[PDB]
Amino acid sequence: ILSTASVLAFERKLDPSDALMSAGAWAQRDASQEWPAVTVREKSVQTVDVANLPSDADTLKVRFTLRVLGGAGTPSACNDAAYRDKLLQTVATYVNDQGFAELARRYAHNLANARFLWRNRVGAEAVEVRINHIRQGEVARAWRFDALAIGLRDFKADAELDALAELIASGLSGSGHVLLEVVAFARIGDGQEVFPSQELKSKTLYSVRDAAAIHSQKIGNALRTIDTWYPDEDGLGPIAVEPYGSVTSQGKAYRQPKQKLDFYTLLDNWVLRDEAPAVEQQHYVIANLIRGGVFGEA
Amino acid sequence: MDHYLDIRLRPDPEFPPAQLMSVLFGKLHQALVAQGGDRIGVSFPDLDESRSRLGERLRIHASADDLRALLARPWLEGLRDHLQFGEPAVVPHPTPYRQVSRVQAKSNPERLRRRLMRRHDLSEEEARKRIPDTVARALDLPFVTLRSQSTGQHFRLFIRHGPLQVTAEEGGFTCYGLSKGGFVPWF
Numbered sequence: 001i002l003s004t005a006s007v008l009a010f011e012r013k014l015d016p017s018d019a020l021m022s023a024g025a026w027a028q029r030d031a032s033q034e035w036p037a038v039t040v041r042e043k044s045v046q047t048v049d050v051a052n053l054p055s056d057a058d059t060l061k062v063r064f065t066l067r068v069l070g071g072a073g074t075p076s077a078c079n080d081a082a083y084r085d086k087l088l089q090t091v092a093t094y095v096n097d098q099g100f101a102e103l104a105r106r107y108a109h110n111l112a113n114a115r116f117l118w119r120n121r122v123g124a125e126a127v128e129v130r131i132n133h134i135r136q137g138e139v140a141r142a143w144r145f146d147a148l149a150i151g152l153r154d155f156k157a158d159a160e161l162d163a164l165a166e167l168i169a170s171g172l173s174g175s176g177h178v179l180l181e182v183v184a185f186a187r188i189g190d191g192q193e194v195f196p197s198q199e200l201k202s203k204t205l206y207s208v209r210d211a212a213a214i215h216s217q218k219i220g221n222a223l224r225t226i227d228t229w230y231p232d233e234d235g236l237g238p239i240a241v242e243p244y245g246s247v248t249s250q251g252k253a254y255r256q257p258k259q260k261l262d263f264y265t266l267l268d269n270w271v272l273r274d275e276a277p278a279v280e281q282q283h284y285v286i287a288n289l290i291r292g293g294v295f296g297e298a
Numbered sequence: 299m300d301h302y303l304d305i306r307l308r309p310d311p312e313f314p315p316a317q318l319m320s321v322l323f324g325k326l327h328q329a330l331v332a333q334g335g336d337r338i339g340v341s342f343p344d345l346d347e348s349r350s351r352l353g354e355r356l357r358i359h360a361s362a363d364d365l366r367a368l369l370a371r372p373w374l375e376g377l378r379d380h381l382q383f384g385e386p387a388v389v390p391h392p393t394p395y396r397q398v399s400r401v402q403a404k405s406n407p408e409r410l411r412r413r414l415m416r417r418h419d420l421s422e423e424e425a426r427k428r429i430p431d432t433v434a435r436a437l438d439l440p441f442v443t444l445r446s447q448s449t450g451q452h453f454r455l456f457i458r459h460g461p462l463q464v465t466a467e468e469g470g471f472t473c474y475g476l477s478k479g480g481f482v483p484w485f
Contacts, residue, residue, distance in 0.1 A: 119313075119317075122313075122318070122380070123321055123324075123325075123376070124376055125376055126375070126376075127376070148375060148376065151378075151379055152379040190447075191447075222312075225311065225312075234309055235309065236309045236311060237308070237310075237311065237379075238311070239311040247311045249310060249311050249312055249314055250309060250311065
């Protein structure tokens with residue numbers, strides 16, 4: 001019968017580090033090595049926490065590190081060996097048909113524009129993103145994009161974007177180990193408030209060691225905004241790759257279980273009943289496989 | 299004043315439209331401060347008075363030269379991913395006119411206690427007895443939360459649309475686009 005395993009946990013690919021923040025001045029960003037870090041301070045209004053850029057600074061320095069793992073098809077925990085073999089065969093056919101081509105282009109795009117600067121990008125007049133391919137502690141291949149030219153809603157083509165995309169595809173395929181140091185620069189303004197992640201003093205903000213920072217899962221969610229193949233209406237753009245296409249901002253879920261568009265039914269009939277879905281839909285399925293999960297029946 | 303530019307809010311998978319409205323309103327305030335002029339009118343085409351909703355569409359009213367001066371200003375950078383920009387078309391002739399006004403409130407009694415300290419030199423208990431804590435003003439009006447470059451405190455600015463008239467006379471406009479006696483057409 002080859003039913004779905006009762007445990008099918010997947011470890012996540014595309015590991016994001018906690019994105020630090022730092023204060024800097026534009027046209028001096030080429031020496032961004034000992035800039036001061038944005039610190040969350042306590043100001044009573046009731047006591048609240050706020051984080052704002054210093055007076056003699058106009059650029060944010062959100063920096064994080066990304067590991068591209070590979071082996072997205074292999075589950076960390078499984079019960080049925082036949083189901084694992086069938087799923088691995090299905091992922092092998094997906095890889096042979098296309099070798100992580102389109103998904104890597106979308107991930108390279110989402111790295112190109114500083115969408116991981118969630119609320120630090122809408123109010124910034126100039127956003128610059130620098131991406132390095134560090135190898136053995138040294139930068140092997142350096143990139144430098146401008147986030148304004150690369151929109152949040154279109155997925156175009158570019159030579160540097162193609163190079164970053166083939167690097168991401170090589171990482172996701174398992175042909176090599178890919179380590180990316182992503183540094184983003186945004187002209188948020190002089191003394192304007194920044195928006196780090198919020199912790200649960202009515203409201204408090206995230207920090208790691210005397211420095212405001214963004215949660216790793218926020219950066220991962222921003223990197224998962226590659227889903228454009230849902231039944232879009234009212235002109236919504238790319239959404240974060242989630243099971244049942246859930247978007248908290250809209251408060252509603254696309255790819256409902258009533259339609260044949262959620263991740264679970266397509267995974268099932270793709271590996272159980274051999275009904276391969278559309279190429280875009282199978283891209284969505286492999287995206288859910290890359291992000292990991294606690295999938296499996298009960 | 300005969301022209302208008304319409305801004306629609308693209309739905310956003312990361313942000314509700316309220317803070318997007320606040321960000322764009324701050325950007326247009328900065329653009330009008332840099333540009334100058336007193337003939338820029340704001341409008342909420344889909345303002346809902348049942349639940350004090352701001353709406354999902356924006357209409358800015360100006361002349362042709364004012365509109366091209368506004369769109370020539372580079373404030374539009376960094377916000378195209380969430381808005382529509384139509385064309386500076388002429389407003390329809392048979393349109394009722396209404397006014398927009400910023401209605402502030404004395405919601406904090408301690409501000410006025412500090413004020414009367416600087417005006418009448420009263421003590422703490424005198425201001426406490428003179429001003430109770432129930433004098434806070436609650437407004438069932440749509441609002442936007444912004445912080446200023448001059449003073450970093452976050453201030454809430456209420457926007458209210460006046461009654462529909464049949465004609466409009468010449469009036470002024472503030473830096474926020476709110477009318478100090480002017481009117482904007484409704485359509």
